[PDB]
């Protein structure tokens, strides 16, 4: 999900409506975004959108927040104050799980949010120890579409070497991609023919 200021975020928590923090007057959020996402990215448009959306929701209005329109953060906050809320958008919230109130008044408001179309169910993949194999090199086919594979590339081999791993390298490469036994005459140095059954 992402707000209209360009703050992407992967949804990782499913909190029932009782576990969600709530304000003094019963308002709880749909999304809880970390405050640390702001200062490095300087996405102040999202915060101003929230501080205007609170007053807009209370007044039952819709406002134009087009770029380069005149804006006064002080006047928007005073609009919040005249709407009955605090000068800042901050409110008294209670922890949903334990019922205790937070010491710090929490900034909560309606921020427009977009669900970007990169779904987990499309992108997740897990393949067992067998499937379609490439005819030429005897290796698994490429990608989820071909129904097998996923690549342990050059840099993964470099990293496993840097750890002195091997064994795991033997497993993943040989025993899991195209492991085979190669017979060599040892008297002439050329590949030979061996068959235990026949």
């Amino acid at each position: 999900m992402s707000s209209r200021s360009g703050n992407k975020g992967i949804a990782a928590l499913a909190l029932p409506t009782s576990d969600m923090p709530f304000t003094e007057d019963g308002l709880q959020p749909d999304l809880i975004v970390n405050p640390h996402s702001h200062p490095s990215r300087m996405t102040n448009g999202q915060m101003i959108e929230t501080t205007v959306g609170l007053a807009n929701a209370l007044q039952g209005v819709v406002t134009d927040g087009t770029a380069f329109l005149p804006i006064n953060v002080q006047l928007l906050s005073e609009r919040l104050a005249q709407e009955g809320l605090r000068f800042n958008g901050c409110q008294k919230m209670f922890n949903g799980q334990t019922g205790e109130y937070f010491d710090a008044a929490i900034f909560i408001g309606p921020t427009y949010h977009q669900r970007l179309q990169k779904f987990v169910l499309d992108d997740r993949y897990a393949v067992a120890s067998y499937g379609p194999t490439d005819a030429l090199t005897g290796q698994p086919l490429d990608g989820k579409r071909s129904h097998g594979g996923l690549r342990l590339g050059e840099m993964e081999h470099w990293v496993l070497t840097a750890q002195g791993a091997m064994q795991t390298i033997i497993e993943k490469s040989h025993d899991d991609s195209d492991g085979c036994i190669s017979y060599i005459c040892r008297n002439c140095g050329e590949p030979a023919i061996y068959n235990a059954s026949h």
Binding site: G9, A14, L31, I32, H38, T50, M93, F102, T111, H113
Partner: peptide
């Protein structure tokens, strides 16, 4: 127009994750 609380809640929303 999701209601978004810019707060710390259990640390599950660190490194631009979202608690939904």
């Amino acid at each position: 127009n999701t209601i978004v609380a810019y707060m710390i809640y259990g640390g599950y929303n660190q490194e631009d994750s979202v608690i939904v």
